[PDB]
RNA sequence: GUAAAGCGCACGCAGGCGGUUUGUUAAGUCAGAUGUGAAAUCCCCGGGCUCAACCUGGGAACUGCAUCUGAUACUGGCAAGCUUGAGUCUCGUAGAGGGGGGUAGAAUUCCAGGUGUAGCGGUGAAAUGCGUAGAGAUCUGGAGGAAUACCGGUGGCGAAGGCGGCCCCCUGGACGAAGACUGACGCUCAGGUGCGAAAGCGUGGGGAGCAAACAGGAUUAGAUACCCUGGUAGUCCACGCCGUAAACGAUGUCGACUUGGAGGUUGUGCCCUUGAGGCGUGGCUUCCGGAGCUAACGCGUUAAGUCGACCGCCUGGGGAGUAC
């Protein structure tokens, strides 16, 4: 799991204020950071099906959150994706 | 300390969910029945019993309990009514024709004993026959008086004697039963949140109902 | 519940009636309040009350004339995924008029008799008998 | 098989204990 | 669930459905009006054949479509909201959850040495087999592969298949206390994608024990068949393929409501935790049983009870899950 310091840094960098962990942008940032961290582990192992299932679950959650954010506000979504470099 | 305020209660741990409002709660690890809210319904039952006795109904008593056998027999003899001191025979009400045949046979044997059985034919065989029939004579002490057809019942328990309640319900005979705190109150239409232990309490209850019925004829 | 609050409240009423419960509680809503008012107006229930503002809760008091339940049957008619609409000239009749069918017309929620009298069709919420 | 006897023994779990 | 029928399991696109307030939009829906819906035929009230069939006048009907005018409770679209659904953050808890690398003890087999000497092994009884070039037994070293006794439990974890020595590294999920945050972001899913016991296949290793095939012994007039002695794949590893099970709880996933007892296993709050205890409050799980349900068996708050959303599947037995 992501370290406490990493989560705090992500919240500070993305949250609009303190204790803004529930914002969609913060959730997307945490999910993408975890996905990036786990990519190397999966490449190293490539046989952890159970962990791959958890990775797929978080990827699906991030996609759903991104779709909801795009529907609610185009500007926020288009800024978040370029900041995080998603949606190639 | 009223009449119902003396007994402590029953139903230590296991309870019947049907009679939820009839229990005050759990006190000193043992549930207590709604003693305060017990006297009105009992009075109503007594009034109904008095109404039944207005026509001199054939209200029966069940004495299946050995400890309470004499406790209910005294009330039965005081009211000169029918009672069942021994085990309640299955089908007494539903199969009353068999009981009628049995009591008719008993009456015929009793009438003919003084003439034929004594010394007309034999004595040893007659003595053995009389010894065998003494238990039958003892059984059905009160129910053998008239043709039966009871209009009510006063069984002292429900779970133990559910057969009588079921028979009465099948025949549509109201039952003024003192349902136990862990019995099934569905069968009894006049459920009385009383107690089964504390022989003194049940003795007081039967004495009170006997007194009420005695003066119920006006 | 998560997809049919009306069916959920109808089910709650049926279960409470079968369980011999004095009253039942559920989340409150405008349509639920209107249905409860219509049911009370016809005597199917004793009374209904709403408690709270942020998270309103609707409480309905069941009625028992005798040992048997007054609400013999209650069945949802129009449900999500299959909507039922009837014209004023073909409104449903429950138990040859002995029952009550809830109809939502342009004038609000009312019994089938009221809708027929007003000559307005609508959506058949449910049958109550 | 070397596994069937184990299953047979485990079948007696409900004999008289529960 | 057992009569035919729940995909082996999961993720998820299209699609179907979707918590609670308002605002107006009037698409669905509803009300009225108008135009049309050929005549004949069906139906109702009548008439003419002496009655009937048959013919015929007027209606009704043609359940439909289109346009206009209105109502808008409900559903839908648009704009704001709300926190109960669903999620994020903080602390802590148990776990054979998964991947990788180490290491430990017992045991089997083999190799070699010492002591020792005729049997050992096997069976219902035998024989094949091993042994004087010294077996088996006992001891003492070494090599190797495979699996983890006791704990161990109607115990625990995992979506399913499945997961048992100990330690380390990486990693997934679930649960509990108290808060803060986002504000419907949800449910289900045809196709699609992924996972998926054992056996099997391709390449290259490994091979102790087990063991299809096979060899021999015994039995029989001769066989086959169990039985015995051996024994090759296979079983193990790395990669790739196979995608099948009585893959079962013969019970699809999600949410709500509905009498109760007896446990097991993990949390957590309070009372002298004095402690094991009592009082409560959660998650998972086993058994009995009420209403209700069921053809009965039986299920029974973990429903096969009362409902709602969506998906899959079945409608005689054989042919046949076979042919093309
Ligand atoms: Mg963890
Ligand atoms: Mg079948
Ligand atoms: Mg299944
Ligand atoms: Mg799914
Ligand atoms: Mg979809
Ligand atoms: Mg929609
Ligand atoms: Mg809605
Ligand atoms: Mg319209
Ligand atoms: Mg119209
Ligand atoms: Mg026409
Ligand atoms: Mg609206
Ligand atoms: Mg593990
Ligand atoms: Mg872990
Ligand atoms: Mg490996
Ligand atoms: Mg060794
Ligand atoms: Mg589990
Ligand atoms: Mg807010
Ligand atoms: Mg599919
Ligand atoms: Mg294999
Ligand atoms: Mg082959
Ligand atoms: Mg191979
Ligand atoms: Mg090979
Ligand atoms: Mg052979
Ligand atoms: Mg063999
Ligand atoms: Mg062998
Ligand atoms: Mg299959
Ligand atoms: Mg299995
Ligand atoms: Mg199946
Ligand atoms: Mg059977
Ligand atoms: Mg059961
Ligand atoms: Mg069934
Ligand atoms: Mg057929
Ligand atoms: Mg085929």
From Swiss-Prot, chain A:
Keyword Metal-binding: no
Pfam families tied to this protein: Ribosomal_S15 (PF00312)
Keywords for this protein: Ribonucleoprotein, Ribosomal protein, RNA-binding, rRNA-binding, Translation regulation
Induction line: Part of the metY operon that extends to pnp, also has its own promoter.
One Gene Ontology MF term: structural constituent of ribosome
Keyword DNA damage applies: no
Entry's Gene Ontology cellular component terms: cytoplasm; cytosol; cytosolic small ribosomal subunit
Matches recorded under CDD domains: Ribosomal_S15p_S13e (cd00353)
InterPro entries recorded: Ribosomal_uS15 (IPR000589), Ribosomal_uS15_bac-type (IPR005290), uS15_NS1_RNA-bd_sf (IPR009068)
GO BP field: cytoplasmic translation; regulation of translation; ribosomal small subunit assembly; translation
NCBIfam families for the chain: S15_bact
Family statement drawn from the similarity comment of this UniProt entry: Belongs to the universal ribosomal protein uS15 family.
Function: One of the primary rRNA binding proteins, it binds directly to 16S rRNA where it helps nucleate assembly of the platform of the 30S subunit by binding and bridging several RNA helices of the 16S rRNA. Binds to its own mRNA, stabilizing it 5-UTR and preventing its translation. In the E.coli 70S ribosome it has been modeled to contact the 23S rRNA of the 50S subunit forming part of bridge B4. In the two 3.5 A resolved ribosome structures there are minor differences between side-chain conformations.
PANTHER family assigned to the protein according to its UniProt record, in alphabetical order: RIBOSOMAL PROTEIN S15, BACTERIAL AND ORGANELLAR (PTHR23321), SMALL RIBOSOMAL SUBUNIT PROTEIN US15M (PTHR23321:SF26)
Annotated protein name in UniProt: Small ribosomal subunit protein uS15
Species in which this protein is naturally found: Escherichia coli (strain K12)
Gene this chain is encoded by: rpsO
From Swiss-Prot, chain B:
Gene3D superfamilies: Glucose-6-phosphate isomerase like protein, domain 1 (3.40.50.10490), Helix hairpin bin (1.10.287.610)
HAMAP family on file: Ribosomal_uS2_B
Assembly mode: Part of the 30S ribosomal subunit, contacts bS1. Some nascent polypeptide chains are able to cross-link to this protein in situ. In collided ribosomes contacts ribosome rescue factor SmrB.
Alphabetically ordered keywords of this record: Ribonucleoprotein, Ribosomal protein
Name listed for the protein in its UniProt record: Small ribosomal subunit protein uS2
Role noted for this protein: Required for ribosomal protein bS1 (rpsA) to bind to the 30S subunit.
GO biological-process terms attached to the record: cytoplasmic translation; ribosomal small subunit assembly
Residues the record lists as N6-succinyllysine modifications: 107
Origin superkingdom: Bacteria
InterPro entries membership: Ribosomal_uS2 (IPR001865), Ribosomal_uS2_bac/mit/plastid (IPR005706), Ribosomal_uS2_CS (IPR018130), Ribosomal_uS2_flav_dom_sf (IPR023591)
Gene Ontology cellular component annotations, sorted alphabetically: cytoplasm; cytosolic small ribosomal subunit
UniProt family annotation: Belongs to the universal ribosomal protein uS2 family.
Pfam hit, one: Ribosomal_S2
Native source organism of the sequence: Escherichia coli (strain K12)
GO MF entries: structural constituent of ribosome; zinc ion binding
UniProtKB/Swiss-Prot annotation, chain C:
Coiled coil location: none
Lineage: superkingdom: Bacteria
Keywords: Repressor, Ribonucleoprotein, Ribosomal protein, RNA-binding, rRNA-binding, Translation regulation
GO BP: cytoplasmic translation; regulation of mRNA stability; regulation of translation; ribosomal small subunit assembly
GO molecular function: rRNA binding; structural constituent of ribosome
Family matches, as SUPFAM superfamilies: Ribosomal protein S8
Classification via Pfam families: Ribosomal_S8
A single Gene Ontology CC term: cytosol
PANTHER family in the record: 40S RIBOSOMAL PROTEIN S15A (PTHR11758)
Protein family: Belongs to the universal ribosomal protein uS8 family.
Function as written in the Swiss-Prot or TrEMBL entry: One of the primary rRNA binding proteins, it binds directly to 16S rRNA central domain where it helps coordinate assembly of the platform of the 30S subunit.
Assembly information from the UniProt record: Part of the 30S ribosomal subunit. Contacts proteins S5 and S12.
The protein's name: Small ribosomal subunit protein uS8
Gene for this chain: rpsH
Swiss-Prot record, chain D:
Sequence similarity: Belongs to the bacterial ribosomal protein bS21 family.
Species assigned in the record: Escherichia coli (strain K12)
Quaternary data: Part of the 30S ribosomal subunit. In stalled ribosomes contacts ribosome rescue factor SmrB.
Name this protein carries in UniProt: Small ribosomal subunit protein bS21
Primary role: Probbly involved in recognition of ribosome rescue factor SmrB in stalled/collided disomes; fusion of protein fragments to its N-terminus decreases ribosome rescue in the presence of SmrB.
Portion of the parent chain present: 37 to 54 of 71
Biased composition (Basic residues): 10-18
Superkingdom, taxonomy of origin: Bacteria
The gene coding this protein: rpsU
């Amino acid at each position: 799991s992501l370290s406490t310091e990493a989560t705090a840094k992500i919240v500070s960098e993305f949250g609009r204020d303190a204790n803004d962990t529930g914002s969609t942008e913060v959730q997307v940032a945490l999910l993408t950071a975890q996905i990036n961290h786990l990519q190397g582990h999966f490449a190293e192992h490539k046989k952890d099906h159970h962990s791959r299932r958890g990775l797929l679950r978080m990827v699906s959650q991030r996609r759903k959150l991104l779709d909801y954010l795009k529907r609610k506000d185009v500007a926020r979504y288009t800024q978040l994706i370029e900041r995080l470099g998603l949606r190639r | 300390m009223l009449k119902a305020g003396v007994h402590f209660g029953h139903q230590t741990r296991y309870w019947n969910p049907k009679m939820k409002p009839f229990i005050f709660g759990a006190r000193n690890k043992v549930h207590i029945i709604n003693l305060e809210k017990t006297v009105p319904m009992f009075n109503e039952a007594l009034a109904e019993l008095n109404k039944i006795a207005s026509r001199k109904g054939k209200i029966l008593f069940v004495g299946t309990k050995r400890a309470a056998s004499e406790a209910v027999k005294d009330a039965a003899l005081s009211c000169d009514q029918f009672f069942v001191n021994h085990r309640w025979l299955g089908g007494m009400l539903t199969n009353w024709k068999t009981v009628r045949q049995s009591i008719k046979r008993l009456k015929d044997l009793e009438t003919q004993s003084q003439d034929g059985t004594f010394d007309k034919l034999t004595k040893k065989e007659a003595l053995m026959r009389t010894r065998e029939l003494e238990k039958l004579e003892n059984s059905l002490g009160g129910i053998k008086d008239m043709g039966g057809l009871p209009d009510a019942l006063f069984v002292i328990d429900a779970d133990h004697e559910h057969i009588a309640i079921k028979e009465a319900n099948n025949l549509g005979i109201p039952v003024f039963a003192i349902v136990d705190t862990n019995s099934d109150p569905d069968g009894v239409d006049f459920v009385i949140p009383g107690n089964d232990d504390a022989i003194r309490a049940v003795t007081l209850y039967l004495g009170a109902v006997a007194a009420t019925v005695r003066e119920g004829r006006s | 519940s998560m997809q049919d609050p009306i069916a959920d409240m109808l089910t709650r009423i049926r279960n409470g009636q079968a369980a011999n419960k004095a009253a039942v509680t559920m989340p409150s809503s405008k349509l639920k309040v209107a249905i409860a008012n219509v049911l009370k107006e016809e005597g199917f229930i004793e009374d209904f009350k709403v408690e709270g503002d942020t998270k309103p809760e609707l409480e309905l008091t069941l009625k028992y004339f005798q040992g048997k339940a007054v609400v013999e049957s209650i069945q949802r008619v129009s449900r999500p995924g299959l909507r039922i609409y009837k014209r004023k000239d073909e409104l449903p009749k429950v138990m040859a008029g002995l029952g009550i069918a809830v109809v939502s017309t342009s004038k609000g929620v009312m019994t089938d008799r009221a809708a027929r009298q007003a000559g307005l069709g609508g959506e058949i919420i449910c049958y109550v008998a | 098989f070397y596994e069937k006897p184990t299953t047979e023994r485990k079948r007696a779990k409900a004999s008289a204990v529960k």
